[PDB]
Design a protein around this ligand. Sequence first.
Ligand SMILES: [Cl-]
Lengths: 231, 230, 226
Amino acid sequence: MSDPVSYTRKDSIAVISMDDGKVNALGPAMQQALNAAIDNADRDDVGALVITGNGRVFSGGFDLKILTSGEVQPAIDMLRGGFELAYRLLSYPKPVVMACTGHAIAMGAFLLSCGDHRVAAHAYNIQANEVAIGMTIPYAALEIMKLRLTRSAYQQATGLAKTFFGETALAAGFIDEIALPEVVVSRAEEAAREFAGLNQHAHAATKLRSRADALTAIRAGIDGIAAEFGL
Amino acid sequence: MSDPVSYTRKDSIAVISMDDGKVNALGPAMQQALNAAIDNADRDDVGALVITGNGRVFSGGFDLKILTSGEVQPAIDMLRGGFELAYRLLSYPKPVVMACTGHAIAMGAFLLSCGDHRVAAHAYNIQANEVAIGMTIPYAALEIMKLRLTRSAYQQATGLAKTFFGETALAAGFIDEIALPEVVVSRAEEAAREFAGLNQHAHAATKLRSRADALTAIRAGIDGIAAEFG
Amino acid sequence: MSDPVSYTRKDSIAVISMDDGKVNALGPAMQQALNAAIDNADRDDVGALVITGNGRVFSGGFDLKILTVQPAIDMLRGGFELAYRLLSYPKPVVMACTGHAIAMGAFLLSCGDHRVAAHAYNIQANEVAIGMTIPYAALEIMKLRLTRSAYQQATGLAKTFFGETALAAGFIDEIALPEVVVSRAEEAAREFAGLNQHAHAATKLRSRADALTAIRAGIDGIAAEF
Ligand SMILES: [Cl-]
């Protein structure tokens, strides 16, 4: 799909929407488009970001074709880019609100877990499915999940590839708020406009303090990706 | 008011009540009065402590006048003393039960978070409001919250200044028990009496083990308080 | 009793049941019998393990006669080695909590990848109530599963959990009716045996790395601090 990310500034917020016409795979093209959209948000100096998926998914994860192939450097580059995007969003100086508009799997769940506030509908599944399909979870991904999940949810989400949704996702720490499907996006935008009213300097400084060790470990995980591939 | 804390021994427990006639601001006078009451508990060798607020709040937090007066050293000194009190309570060798008798804001919430057991009523708001009013949360306060809040509640409580109460406070780890307003204090006292029946030596040793990293992090936060402002 | 652990292979899984006829005390004999049953699972290369208690308890904990110095140290080290063996097990481990789980019984329960109990069953580290400081190895096992605030109360206040409160605390993962705790555990185990074994084993070690290091330290330190 020709333009997998849209960027729209609406007063105090920017809305960044993923729709590649498929499952919003976080391959190189999608990552480039997402980074370009956040660059726009930087230039526009917005009060808050909203990131959404499409009518089917938030994101189904990395480009599975690149993963299943066995190619080495392309996979390393895709994983590094995905986790760098996570680092960028977790450290973002403005509030970031995720509109989880469908299921969020693997890198989709990791991306979702970078929002300051995360809104989903009851039925939307959130899952690190890596272990179910033969992939060991990268250290950077573990650190992203560890930052948000309860101790017991973290255990099951990782080693057992547990699927969460609705009340179990809320209790686990995979999402912060449940809304009806037709208002997930509007509620995300409402929340973003509210958070834009927080003191930006204090928000930016405090969120970094509240994530310092995780960010350091994510950085280490990004640096270590090639070694995870035996290089 | 000049006499903001009362101390009452009731057999196996001591009840320490904050009431400055207003919102129990945790300025130097209140901190000294709380410390004096805890000194009394030390001398009495009580089985457990109960700390309460007044009829309208647990505590609204630090003295707002001192906090925003522009005079840096008095503000630093007040924060230091507040976090020192938190350290003292988190490491206290007897069970400590908090009766959250109204809202608990900022340092009020941090103080609340030092209790082994914390009781509130459903409508009582518990909130680190720093970011909403333009303040970065001090490291010592972050570490206090980090010890009690779930991973996701910690994120929202801090960077988003989220308000918690009732079920969300329970789920988050900002409180351990919700009771009707009229029985918050008596529930806290009853719980304290039961905890006084635990083995004190094992309680004191176990709680320190269960808080070891938090305590060193809080101590670092206290030692680095001036550097936070310069 | 004379034969306190049973081992049965069914489908892709092994079911290991503790029943010493009493409260499944985790003394040296029970630990040896459990280790031998896990050996069977190793030899059979099973897809997953289910560990159950008996009709009255999961386990009441250590043999108190021994705990109340060298025999005590040895029993504690052995119990925490058993915990370590299960926490690091290369196949999914499902616990069928068939009654209460107290002290070492709760620590053992907390080593399962998935833990199923009935609403009524109490789970508690009662050490502080009975005059014992909780060992570091036990603290680290609990710290891996309990929420921040449940961890505080479970330890220093010897809080008892059950059903929805155990679920919220992270002392269990699933509640089932008493009569289906074991069958649900087996169903979960069959499901988990379908996960990729290599990825499961590698990922669980990563998700538990710091805890395993700290539990090893806790085992090593059992004597130095008794
Ligand atoms: Cl947690």
